[PDB]
Design an enzyme around this catalytic site. Structure first.
Site, mmCIF file in Angstrom:
data_model
loop_
_atom_site.group_PDB
_atom_site.id
_atom_site.type_symbol
_atom_site.label_atom_id
_atom_site.label_comp_id
_atom_site.label_asym_id
_atom_site.label_seq_id
_atom_site.Cartn_x
_atom_site.Cartn_y
_atom_site.Cartn_z
ATOM 1 N N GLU A 140 10.038 85.210 69.611
ATOM 2 C CA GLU A 140 10.643 86.178 69.597
ATOM 3 C C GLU A 140 10.112 86.856 70.052
ATOM 4 O O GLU A 140 9.204 86.468 71.158
ATOM 5 C CB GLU A 140 10.811 85.977 67.580
ATOM 6 C CG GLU A 140 10.703 87.398 67.083
ATOM 7 C CD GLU A 140 11.577 88.042 67.556
ATOM 8 O OE1 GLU A 140 12.013 88.477 66.686
ATOM 9 O OE2 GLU A 140 12.943 87.648 68.663
ATOM 10 N N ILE A 163 8.755 89.909 69.701
ATOM 11 C CA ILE A 163 7.987 91.001 69.972
ATOM 12 C C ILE A 163 7.874 91.403 68.046
ATOM 13 O O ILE A 163 9.045 91.488 67.773
ATOM 14 C CB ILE A 163 8.192 92.164 70.484
ATOM 15 C CG1 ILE A 163 6.634 93.050 70.076
ATOM 16 C CG2 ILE A 163 8.912 93.115 70.045
ATOM 17 C CD1 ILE A 163 6.865 94.722 71.278
ATOM 18 N N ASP A 198 6.411 94.181 66.126
ATOM 19 C CA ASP A 198 6.491 95.093 65.831
ATOM 20 C C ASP A 198 5.560 95.825 64.656
ATOM 21 O O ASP A 198 5.003 95.650 64.297
ATOM 22 C CB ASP A 198 7.251 96.459 66.390
ATOM 23 C CG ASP A 198 7.303 97.602 66.884
ATOM 24 O OD1 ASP A 198 5.699 98.079 66.074
ATOM 25 O OD2 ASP A 198 7.534 98.162 67.504
#
Ligand SMILES: O=c1[nH]cnc2c([C@@H]3N[C@H](COP(=O)(O)O)[C@@H](O)[C@H]3O)c[nH]c12
Ligand SMILES: O=c1[nH]cnc2c([C@@H]3N[C@H](COP(=O)(O)O)[C@@H](O)[C@H]3O)c[nH]c12
Lengths: 213, 216
Positions: free
Chosen positions: A126, A128, A130
């Site tokens: 993936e 990022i 967050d």
């Protein structure tokens, strides 16, 4: 060595190229690639000793191999450039693996095509983490549909200050500031993904391209 | 620099790494990357001066720009590594562009995954594909994109052209490399998803094609 400067307009220039949409440089290509290759070695070192369901020779458990490779699921569209670079480093370190894709949007838009992941080691690639909500959604879906032996996540970037739900990836290449990042796969309505460097976006510029593509 | 040789078992070795599934080396990473960057310059030089529908200002027509980028449709799964490299070279040459993906398969051709872009009418569209062999896959894709999206122009860029495989007329507008009339592996080219991560392109030993018969 990358050359990083600002022009008379105050705009960041990397190797002669201006980035007027950028607030700050986060990482140069050289730093990004070195960080990905380092994690590739960690991934190869961790998985090469493991075994999982044998679907090549009719059971039961056998070592990760070209006959029974590590299963990698890449999240489209954001992780495609990161994945292309990572798989080549994984090949350098001799990790047998195969890649399938799932596409999510902000809904599942495209499902995986692999149908024999039961009892297999599965690694998600993936872009990022967050808030953590996107990966909690993907992990739950992949675990329920495929029943893997193990399910881990490798992210290019971790923004630890953005978390809203518990999500700790197993492998992290780079840590980003608590700002909207662009470049190396990171986008504003599909723009900026082709940049070889990661930058923070100037505030309010996330609404620069309102038209749906 | 690369060193290409055969070991005592007659197996091809590139930079110390053995490739026992390979019959011949087609291209090293350095040759492939040089070829892709050269086509990137051709693509940028070709589209840079063109204009197409303005969907940013809802206007009539406007130059290819970050506001109205070149539309790239990359064909999964074989083209994703090629696409990742090409887009970075296209950025080096300053070509404004955005990328979406479609996936096709044969049973006769069928769409596995559709593009999500919904405003391609009157836009310049470039297809990025791994290889043209018989030409049937791209003829299907071009016919579908043309009728469903009605783009201003529709062109194809392939990483590889296998000239001797053609069964239907198909000459991509842009071609990075020409390959022999043999099954190629590496740099996105697969045998049941194996070999895609190779940095070099090879021909496959004919006995290796059915080495991984189990569905993934
Ligand atoms: O800083 C950023 N720059 C660019 N995209 C994002 C995203 C996007 N949102 C998704 C991850 O979301 P999250 O962990 O917040 O649920 C990513 O896959 C990206 O699509 C979060 N942060 C960022
Ligand atoms: O030599 C090859 N090596 C690996 N894949 C292929 C293919 C695959 N078949 C598709 C296109 O073939 P065609 O032009 O025959 O319809 C490609 O996108 C590839 O996925 C043709 N030839 C080859």
């Amino acid at each position: 060595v990358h050359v990083v400067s600002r022009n008379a307009e105050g705009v960041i220039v990397v190797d002669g190229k201006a980035y007027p949409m950028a607030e700050e440089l986060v990482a140069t290509e050289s730093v990004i690639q070195r960080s990905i290759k380092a994690v590739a070695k960690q991934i190869a070192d961790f998985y090469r000793p493991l075994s999982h369901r044998d679907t090549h020779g009719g059971g039961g458990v056998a070592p990760i191999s070209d006959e029974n490779p590590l299963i990698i699921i890449s999240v489209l569209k954001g992780s495609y450039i990161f994945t292309a670079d990572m798989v080549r480093y994984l090949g350098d370190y001799g990790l047998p693996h195969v890649v399938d894709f799932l596409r999510v949007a902000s809904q599942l838009l495209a499902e995986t095509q692999f149908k024999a992941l039961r009892g297999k080691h599965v690694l998600i690639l993936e872009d990022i983490v967050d808030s953590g909500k996107t990966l909690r959604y993907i992990l739950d879906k992949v675990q329920r549909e495929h029943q893997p032996a193990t399910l881990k996540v490798c992210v290019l970037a971790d923004k630890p200050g953005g978390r809203r739900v518990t999500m700790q990836p197993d492998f992290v290449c780079l840590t980003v500031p608590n700002k909207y990042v662009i470049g190396y796969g990171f986008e504003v309505n599909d723009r900026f993904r082709c940049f070889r460097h990661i930058f923070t976006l100037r505030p309010g510029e996330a609404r620069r391209y309102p038209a749906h593509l």
